[PDB]
Design a protein around this ligand. Structure first.
Ligand code: GA3
Lengths: 334, 150, 109, 434
């Protein structure tokens, strides 16, 4: 009953249907019902013809592990006819052109890059931010556990940086921003960490409702348990099906600010935008993550939304949507 | 009731009637009579008959008590399988000649467990047996089972 | 100096891969390995709630070829990724369709 | 109408039934929480779902059971001088469309010269296309290998048996009309499935129609004899009938000796053969009308998702080129063999005929889901929503070869598509009388 008062009806129905679907796809043993999940999933296809100023196409970047990347960009002003296959990868026009490398959510278990809920989000990102967007399709646990996701992210980052038609006039370099949501926030953080001590320079990070955790139950898990379409049972199943068997939640991929994790002080890290929904079950961890950055000496602007829940960036019928979009547009075009 | 069993050698074993009815063959011969004077055994060694009798005895006793537990039984079975090769062999022949299904399952399970995760060059070493296949037949059977070698 | 019946009694309780390995040790063991009952038991190990008789299905499978060619052609590669997985009704339908199609492929006019 | 937001999201929910859907979701949730793991296992493996986009119907079904254009382009990485080849091909098409012969000839020569150093799939696609344009300038076993080297026919056939079986449960006499007997490699599985059923294996009648034998032989007789022998070897009643005809426009409703609809069920099958009728004016319409007159319980259609019936020749060239280049790219991993070579030759011939034969001779005139559905909707045919079962079957099929990679089944609007990742290639669907 409380959930029907904080969100509109359409977001409520969408999130409730997702919650029910992923309830019936869970399994206590640890196995995951892949075929029924892919059946119940709603996907889309690339379309080279412009649609409100945004076309797109698939790129098979890696063949050994079927690593695909869906690229989006604005429609061409100087071309009245639809872009041909040859014209799809023409170099961009403008002094500075940002490239947002995006990772979608789904607790390493649901959705895909060509899923519609994320296709629409990437199209809106391209429209409002006015820049190129590359969506990576990493592999999904539990069939393929740690660390295949960070490797897929790193390979896609290398491919994006190694391109030529995606460059800048002023410095002949690529202006890459890493972005993600839910599990994609964790993937973006880890790939940015890897790039920090590799050579590739990253401009910034855009973490949306990141997924961090630990062993000690914080003070927002008890009360919020089963209130805003998020429980703790699932929070353990997803972490158990991802980390290697015989490991706790203090692993570094689950908690970077752990005694076994390397300190962020003394290493290079870029600026980042941490968006935190106040009414989500995981509100004490995301904020703690920001504080770990704050004491580590790195720049971070915290955006605590006191009346937002999970999935607040899927429909435009609320006020938080416009706000977040404006902040990202001012943080990418700064 | 007490039943006298006579081994082939000539040792005599006193058994509980109940224990004897665990063997359906002995029970069947008892209903057919001609067994009150004594039940001899043509091919059965006294030592193996003694080991089987202890097994059935313990089992029957445990069962009766429970009706009036599984962990203790399992422990006893594991402790009674601490022998060598040829004794297990005499026991399987005796179990077959007397038809005591539970002991047969235990002995067949132990043999299956020792030959678990073994290859053609291992089982042969364990049993010292002769491979009598010709090169063509051996390659054909190997090719039929090649999926098992990957 | 083992006989035949006892070899079957011992091998009734062995796993598939081990029985396949044991089929190449000696002659008596090789002969005992093709008895369709052992492979029938190994194939119907996880078949819960099938929907037809175990005799009818046995008749059809024996008509189409057997069980040694049904678990070492389609069931194996299909179970290679995830070993610990019970086989439902879909596995039976798919494997039997492939087996019947193969029998048709080998059939002579 | 339909909610804009949800519609672009990927769901079909009426604006007057939102509250109802929400209430149903709440009840379903409470009921699922009340039951234990068994309830979930039951909905995981036992039940089936049809058309998930319709949230209302789907939820209703769940409740009752618990408590009884768009052009896809995939740029590959293997491309170092590919632009020179594509450019040359386009130039050849443009010169052919502008009336200039000398230009086209020179262009073709150049294409061959630049195609002699290219490797991978580009070499085969460019060579076959160059041959096709040479044929154009001049006029101005294969199937078995393909079936044993590609999953297209196998996936189509299995999905078709699943649909017919799901439309034949609880019936007695089943008649099947096939518009393409070919080798009859689909019927075995259907026959066994109809045998190992619950209630008894019913009588099976089959009437297959095929193209006139080119060598004056008897192939339908061999298929019928083989099917009857395997039938007996499986213990099921079976009647066979073979037919020889050129196209599908000559087929009639009387020339098929049908029984009363009230005492039998008829099912029509088609696997890549409907797109051959579009060339005769009035054909497709006549066949659709006769099918309607036949009043069947299911009509299975398998087709290629591509628009090649476009008037402009340039568009056809471009589309076909990209579609066949991605198709050839999808067979570069399998090792060198004989089936692969045979299939490549078959594809090449197909491409050549498409870019060399015009008028009625051209039979390879494909269309997409939307067009086909509009053609079917003008005659009185409604869709037939496939379920999760067919999806799972196809999944397993692809997982048997090459550890299930590359080809991916996607369900969209009640139809299945097998495609190279996100590029739909084969679209299977079923229809019935509205
Ligand atoms: C089991 C889960 C996982 C959810 C929350 C939920 O409780 C309900 C469904 C998931 C989810 C679905 C899509 C979005 O990616 C997400 C962030 C959301 O809002 O809801 C997704 C979110 C997540 O991936 O964390």
């Amino acid at each position: 009953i409380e959930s029907r008062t904080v969100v509109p009806l359409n977001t409520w129905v969408l999130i409730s249907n997702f919650k029910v679907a992923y309830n019936i796809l869970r399994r206590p043993d640890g196995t995951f019902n892949r075929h029924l999940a892919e059946y119940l999933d709603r996907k889309v296809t690339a379309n080279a013809n412009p649609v409100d100023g945004v076309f797109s196409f698939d790129v098979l970047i890696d063949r050994r592990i079927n690593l695909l990347s869906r690229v989006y960009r604005p429609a061409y002003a100087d071309q009245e006819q639809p872009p041909s296959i040859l014209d799809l990868e023409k170099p961009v026009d403008g002094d500075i052109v940002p490239v947002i490398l995006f990772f979608h959510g789904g607790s390493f278990a649901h959705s895909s890059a060509n899923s519609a809920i994320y296709d629409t989000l990437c199209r809106r990102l391209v429209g409002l931010c006015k820049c190129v967007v590359v969506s990576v399709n990493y592999r999904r646990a539990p069939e393929n556990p740690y660390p295949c996701a960070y490797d897929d992210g790193w390979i896609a980052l290398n491919w994006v940086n190694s391109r030529s038609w995606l460059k800048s006039k002023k410095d002949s370099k690529v202006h890459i921003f890493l972005a993600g949501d839910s599990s994609g926030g964790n993937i973006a953080h880890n790939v940015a960490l890897r790039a920090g001590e590799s050579g590739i320079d990253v401009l910034g990070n855009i973490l949306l409702n990141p997924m961090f955790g630990g062993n000690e139950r914080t003070e927002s898990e008890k009360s919020l348990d089963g209130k805003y379409f998020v429980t703790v049972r699932d929070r353990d199943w997803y972490w158990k099906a991802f980390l290697p068997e015989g490991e706790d939640r203090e692993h570094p991929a689950c908690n970077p600010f752990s005694p076994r994790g390397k300190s962020l002080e003394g290493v290079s890290f870029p600026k980042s935008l941490v968006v935190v929904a106040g009414l989500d079950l995981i509100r004490d961890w995301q904020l703690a993550y920001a504080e770990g950055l704050k004491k580590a000496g790195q720049e971070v602007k915290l955006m605590h939304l006191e009346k937002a829940t999970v999935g607040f960036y899927l429909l435009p019928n609320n006020n938080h949507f416009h706000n977040v979009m404006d902040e990202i547009s001012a943080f990418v075009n700064a | 009731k007490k039943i006298v069993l006579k081994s082939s050698d000539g040792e005599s074993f006193e058994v509980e009637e109940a224990v004897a009815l665990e063997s359906q063959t002995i029970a069947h011969m008892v209903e057919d009579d001609c067994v009150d004077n004594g039940v001899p055994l043509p091919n059965v060694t006294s030592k193996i008959l003694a080991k089987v009798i202890e097994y059935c005895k313990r089992h029957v006793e445990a069962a009766a008590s429970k009706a009036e537990s599984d962990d203790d039984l399992k422990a006893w079975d594991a402790d009674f399988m601490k022998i060598d090769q040829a004794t297990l062999f005499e026991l399987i022949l005796a179990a077959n000649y007397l038809n005591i299904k539970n002991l047969l399952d235990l002995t067949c399970q132990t043999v299956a467990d020792m030959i678990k995760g073994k290859t053609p060059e291992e089982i042969r070493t364990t049993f010292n047996i002769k491979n009598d296949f010709t090169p063509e037949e051996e390659e054909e059977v190997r090719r039929e089972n090649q999926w098992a070698f990957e | 100096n083992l006989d035949e019946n006892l070899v079957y009694e011992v091998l009734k309780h062995v796993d598939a891969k081990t029985l396949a390995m044991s089929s190449c040790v000696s002659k008596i063991w090789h002969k005992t390995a093709q008895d369709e009952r052992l492979w029938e038991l190994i194939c119907t190990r996880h078949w819960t709630n099938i929907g037809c008789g175990q005799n009818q299905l046995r008749s059809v499978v024996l008509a189409l070829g057997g069980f040694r060619r049904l678990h070492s052609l389609y069931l194996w590669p299909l179970s290679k990724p995830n070993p610990r997985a019970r086989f439902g009704k879909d596995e039976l339908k798919l494997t039997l369709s492939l087996l019947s199609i193969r029998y048709y492929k080998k059939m002579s006019f | 109408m339909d909610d804009e937001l949800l519609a672009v999201l990927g769901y079909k929910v009426r604006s007057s039934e939102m509250a109802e859907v929400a209430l149903k979701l709440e009840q379903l949730e409470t009921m699922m929480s009340n039951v234990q793991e068994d309830g979930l296992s039951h909905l995981a493996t036992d039940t089936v779902h049809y058309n998930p986009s319709e949230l209302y119907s789907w939820l209703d079904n769940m409740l009752s059971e618990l408590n009884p254009s768009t052009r896809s382009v995939i740029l590959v990485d293997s491309q170092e001088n590919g632009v020179r080849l594509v450019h040359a091909l386009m130039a050849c098409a443009e010169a052919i469309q502008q009336n200039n012969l000398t230009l086209a000839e020179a262009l073709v020569k150049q294409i061959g010269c630049l195609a002699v150093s290219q490797a991978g799939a580009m070499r085969k696609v460019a060579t076959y296309f160059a041959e096709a344009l040479a044929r154009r300038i001049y006029r101005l076993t294969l199937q078995m290998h393909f079936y044993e080297t590609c999953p297209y026919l196998k996936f189509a056939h299995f999905t078709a048996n699943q649909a017919i079986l799901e439309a034949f449960e609880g019936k007695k006499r089943v008649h099947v009309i096939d518009f393409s007997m070919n080798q009859g490699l689909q019927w075995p599985a259907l026959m066994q499935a109809l045998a190992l059923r619950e209630g008894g294996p019913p009588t099976f009648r089959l009437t297959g129609i095929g193209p006139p034998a080119p060598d004056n032989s008897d192939h339908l007789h061999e298929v019928g004899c083989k099917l009857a022998q395997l039938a007996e070897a499986i213990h099921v009643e079976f009647e066979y009938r073979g037919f020889v005809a050129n196209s599908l426009a000559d087929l009639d409703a009387s020339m098929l000796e049908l029984r009363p609809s009230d005492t039998e069920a008829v099912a029509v099958n088609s696997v890549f053969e409907l797109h051959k009728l579009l060339g005769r004016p009035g054909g497709i319409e006549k066949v659709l009308g006769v099918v309607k007159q036949i009043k069947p319980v299911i009509f299975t259609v398998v087709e290629q998702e591509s628009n090649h019936n476009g008037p402009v020749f340039l568009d056809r060239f471009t589309e076909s080129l990209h579609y066949y280049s991605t198709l050839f790219d999808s067979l570069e991993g399998v090792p060198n063999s004989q089936d692969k070579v045979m299939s490549e030759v078959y594809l090449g011939k197909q491409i050549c005929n498409l870019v060399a034969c015009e008028g009625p001779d051209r039979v390879e005139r494909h269309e997409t889901l939307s067009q086909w559905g509009n053609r079917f909707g003008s005659s009185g045919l409604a869709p037939a929503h496939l379920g999760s079962n067919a999806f799972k079957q196809a999944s397993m099929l692809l997982s048997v070869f090459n550890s299930g990679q590359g080809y991916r089944v996607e369900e969209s609007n009640g139809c299945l598509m097998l495609g190279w990742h996100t590029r739909p290639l084969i679209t299977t669907s079923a229809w019935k009388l509205s």
